Amino acid sequence: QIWLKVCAASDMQPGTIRRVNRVGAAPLAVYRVGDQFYATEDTCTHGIASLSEGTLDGDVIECPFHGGAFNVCTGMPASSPCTVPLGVFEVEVKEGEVYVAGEKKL
Amino acid sequence: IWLKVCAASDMQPGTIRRVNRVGAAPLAVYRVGDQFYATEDTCTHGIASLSEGTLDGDVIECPFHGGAFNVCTGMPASSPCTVPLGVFEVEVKEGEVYVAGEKKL
Amino acid sequence: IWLKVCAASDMQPGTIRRVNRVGAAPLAVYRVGDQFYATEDTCTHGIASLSEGTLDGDVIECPFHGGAFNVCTGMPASSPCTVPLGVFEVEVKEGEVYVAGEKK
Amino acid sequence: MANVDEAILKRVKGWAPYVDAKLGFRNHWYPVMFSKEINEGEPKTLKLLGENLLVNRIDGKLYCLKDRCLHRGVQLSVKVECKTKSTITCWYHAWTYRWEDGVLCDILTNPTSAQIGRQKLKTYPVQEAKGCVFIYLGDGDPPPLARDTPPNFLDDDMEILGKNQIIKSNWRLAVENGFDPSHIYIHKDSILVKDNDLALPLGFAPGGDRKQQTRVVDDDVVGRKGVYDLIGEHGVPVFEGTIGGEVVREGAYGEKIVANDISIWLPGVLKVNPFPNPDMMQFEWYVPIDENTHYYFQTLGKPCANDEERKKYEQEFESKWKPMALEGFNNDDIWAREAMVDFYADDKGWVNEILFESDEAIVAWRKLASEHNQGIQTQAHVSGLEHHH
Amino acid sequence: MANVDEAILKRVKGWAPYVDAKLGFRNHWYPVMFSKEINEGEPKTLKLLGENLLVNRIDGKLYCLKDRCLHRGVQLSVKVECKTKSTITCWYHAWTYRWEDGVLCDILTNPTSAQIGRQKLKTYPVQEAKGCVFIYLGDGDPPPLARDTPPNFLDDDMEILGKNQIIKSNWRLAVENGFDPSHIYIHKDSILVKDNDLALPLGFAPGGDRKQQTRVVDDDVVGRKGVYDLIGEHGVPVFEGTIGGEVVREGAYGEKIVANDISIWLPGVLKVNPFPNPDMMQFEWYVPIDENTHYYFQTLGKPCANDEERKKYEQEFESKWKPMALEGFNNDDIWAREAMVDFYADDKGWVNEILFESDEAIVAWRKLASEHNQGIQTQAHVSGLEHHH
Amino acid sequence: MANVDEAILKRVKGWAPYVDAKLGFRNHWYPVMFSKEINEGEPKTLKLLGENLLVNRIDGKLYCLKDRCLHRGVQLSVKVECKTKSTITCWYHAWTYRWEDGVLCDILTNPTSAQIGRQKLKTYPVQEAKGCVFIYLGDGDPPPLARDTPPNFLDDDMEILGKNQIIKSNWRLAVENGFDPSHIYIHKDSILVKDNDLALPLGFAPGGDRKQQTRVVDDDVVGRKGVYDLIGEHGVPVFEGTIGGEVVREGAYGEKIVANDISIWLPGVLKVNPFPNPDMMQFEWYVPIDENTHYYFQTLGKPCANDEERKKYEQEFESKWKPMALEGFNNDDIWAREAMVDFYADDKGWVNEILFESDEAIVAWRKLASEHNQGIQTQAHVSGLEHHH
Ligand code: FES
Ligand code: FES
Ligand code: FES
Ligand code: FES
Ligand code: FES
Ligand code: FES
Ligand SMILES: [Fe+2]
Ligand SMILES: [Fe+2]
Ligand SMILES: [Fe+2]
């Protein structure tokens, strides 16, 4: 579970979001900012919203519930009412394949 | 059947002319460009005289509350007006403007 | 009668200088461009010092409430000021600034 | 000036100033109390056109000062301190003003202050006439009181008796109800109509052109501005009210003919003659206190040639006219005014009202008031006029 | 329709129409009273969606007219004057309207007025069902009443009894509190719990995916639009509340199983089945009166085959159900609603609320309501629609 | 910011922050009650700087939590539920917080909820000193209490006794009235003057220049910021009040010399020494509750070396000082503050006030407060800080 198979870097266009469901664990969200990939918990820290259903503006994801937002790279809140940082998960591409860590950084 | 209002000359485009009728309520004649139209003079929303209002295109605005009507159809154009205005047939036979005694059905 | 305030060059354009007079109310000398004017220094609406205010053209804005006066006529230019300011004619002779001792 | 949503004022082109005059018209005289209500050396407080005022009687003469200290804006009346016959001292820091011209003549807490003799508390002209106290809520030299009073009110032989109280409605609703030709309907069951055998129709079926429905007076020998309701000149009195052809109500078939001479005058006073009896007259003011309240200053006049008739009149007034007419008749006007508050409260009623024929009288008043008022009282006049650049 | 700051509506992309519906949804049926409260020829007043209305019973049939005269906007109810069986006459200038179509048919103060037969007072459809009075606060021919009722309410054998009152909170706070799965916690000490030996958990530990938490109904043959709360299908009911691992509270271990089927339906009526008894059902509406108040229209349903059973039910209603349930149980819902007023009063609560799992049910409702409501009531609807071109 | 019309703030360039601080200054310590008023496990509610707070004493120590559940924003105090000694459980959906750090540690309605341990209710530092409860309404680590207390209040031997109440006026009007040199005039008839043989002038005739009128303290090592009123150093006290040169009122010629050392300190606490007796001191706070009210936290300090002395002082406080000074003297300050409400309520008084010489002290305070306050409390702080990417 260290590295989770997401998809081919080819399956994602710049500025898109993908939800990664995990057995017995909370979902993750993978964002493609250009040719780089990032990932955080999928659930907004302000409620029960799914960030994968939000709007990505550059490196900032906006929650579809209340307009709160986070920086997808650091997981830090970017817009109120969000105040709790998101857990960030490492993403690496091996053989044009996208992988996300099973455990968050720290 | 018809009443002589005035000469198409006496009316500049974009102006209104009140036509009083003995034994009946007043009417208003509007010149929108080169065509003429006629309706009741009294606003359906109260007791204002539309001839004292402001004409903008084919829409006349009442001086009392700002309600308005389309002078061609007589249909309300702006609130608070809700009751359509009575429209009358107009004719310009030989530079002379005429208005029908009764509203066009 | 007349009081020597200072050399014209002692004041940069658009600045104000307070002139104290023993046994009398202080005055404010304003330099609008290369012109000089003088009025009472105390705002007529309170205890503010107009010399610590903002000069906008020929109008002085009080630092307390934003009231204002035309430093040339002394008449209020902005509320809440309502009582006209005392104005003093100023004389600039040989680059020297002098102000009348009494309002006029 | 600027009391109502600009979008609403734009719509009411016939009388925008009137609709804007929420707080009343400045630069006019207004009755606020009766002479007997204010005694020598006993200051009285009141609010007029939204302004708190103080009135005092010194050596028999009335004086009026704004009830707001220039210093920190407190009402002097919270704790009146008249330390000398000609002055009043603020209870807070002792700023002292002269009743005569409002000049700040002393400051007990600092006798060396540069403010002394350099500030003036607002004063307003005050005049007593017919036992009534009028205040000129305006600036500069006041015009003759006659300008702002209905014809004959100041007649030498006219004996005036009345009542005053505060009513919860904007002053304009009161004015319009009073001058409303068809509002008579609310009086159909009044005790006065029966107990004084008055003839009272339910309303009027208008006759003639609308120009003939009213008579506007643009100028009297004294500059009066007003409108006469002439609906009864060519109109047909309605004595039988029908619904679907069936008679459901009847007017009063009394012998006494009254109120066939009705006029409204700026700043807002109604004259009904004769009323409530063929030999009497009623003059009533609707004085703005604030945007939600007004003084309903009622007066009944009757010519009297001597102390005898005056004494007799005052007896009839207290025993009959006051309770039967001023109260028994006019009480219905009070709740009718209150009933229009909600509709006009958001200023939307001035656009949504649906008028009918008899309202030509009200329309004439709104236009006259809009064209000849001497100024619009604004909230700024209340807090302090403001202007920048 | 702009009832809230645009900045806030822009933030709540999932249910903006709902957040904007502070005054309720127009074009829906709403219960406002019980049939037995409105008697023949006795007009009754009430406010619905901010509009003052008058309801009258004529020949057994109900009629609804807006309680605001077209003329000067006064409420006709200030002094009701129904002079003929089919009409009502305004007490002010006698404009007379027909109850069946609102047409201005007569004017006693001026029978020759051109307004007669040309103006129309707003009317609203009224329908009685299950001893409840429903008013269609909307325009045009009304849809079937069943569209705006929860399933089974109109069942032939369903005996409906209840109570209604005015509560001080916006209708939405009442709805959400009602459909809120986890709010059961506030009922843990209700007398109904012990006195009716109810099984009642403290909360629910969710199970399954988001979609499984509810069943959204937007394909109901009757047109009904609503949501079913299915939290208890995959979760685990909480019967032992713990803090730090230590049990501090327990749910009710009674035998009677209740409220296992809960659903909310537009325009805002909750159905709880079975409740308060395993053989009964509860139907309650949260009707908008104005932005700060709503009617809490409670009803209890119990099948009855004969008048004999209907009495037994009625008796237990009065002696047990109404006292022990509608009040003993639901009174805590009342102050719970009131407790949320401050947070949402400035509309900021709609942005700052921090939701948890069980609120998935509330979210479903907000989305359903936002997508299937038949119109947003606005203050303009209350004062008078405004438009230009 | 966003508390006052920008147009007004632009006009008061000398103290805009102060004029904008209608809700008080954030990040300062404020006394809100006396220690003996908050007992073990007996949560108390209070509003400070517009925020609803809950205070509780557990194992003798005080803890402060915002009285607003993070879930649906209700006040936890509507129905306090302290299930365990170290926690409080919202009565609505049972979200449970620890008094010690506000961490959401449990949720009785959903033990599996993902919110558990990932949300935190706002907490504020609380400290007891001299029998007074101080709350640091600010963010981050608080500064020493000493910074927000006037000199000597924290002295080892200073015995503090007091009284607290809610007063209907903005806190700034209270601060200015207290530091106002000339307001002494309102106390000329106080029972304390005669009953305690006080020497009390009616006011002061200032002397020297502006800078000499006060001493601005911004160099204090403990960090306290304040201003000393030195009007009496070069000014002549007024004992004979005159109007037109004639004596109309005299000051008090008592033997006891008091209040010759007056100072105001941020966040808004006045120190009058010595008062009400030559061997005592008075320290009073005007704590902002909301825009229209404040706590008038009065304390009288007197050196005591043992229980026998402090017990004697307490008896004297209850029998004399409290009724004769705190009430007998200061009650006039209360209505004086209230009298200024109307003028400043619309924020216009901050522009229209006409100041005189002694107000130099108030101006100094306004400037000090504007420059050294630790933050402007805003409505956003109350509802929830806002920031958009
Ligand atoms: S749930 Fe994401 S901002 Fe509120
Ligand atoms: S009378 Fe014409 S808009 Fe009202
Ligand atoms: S002291 Fe100058 S504007 Fe007020
Ligand atoms: S408020 Fe009147 S003298 Fe100060
Ligand atoms: S307000 Fe109803 S008839 Fe005039
Ligand atoms: S509002 Fe407190 S737990 Fe829901
Ligand atoms: Fe009347
Ligand atoms: Fe409930
Ligand atoms: Fe004091």
Side-chain angles (χ1 to χ4, degrees), chain E residues 322-337:
Chain E
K322 177 180 177 177
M324 195 187 298
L326 299 188
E327 314 179 317
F329 189 83
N330 289 141
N331 279 343
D332 289 330
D333 290 307
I334 297 178
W335 59 262
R337 302 170 194 171

Side-chain angles (χ1 to χ4, degrees), chain F residues 177-178 180 183-184 186-187 284 296 329-330 332-333:
Chain F
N177 174 75
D180 187 335
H183 91 286
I184 191 173
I186 70 174
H187 299 300
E284 49 180 39
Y296 179 26
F329 190 82
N330 293 131
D332 281 323
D333 290 302

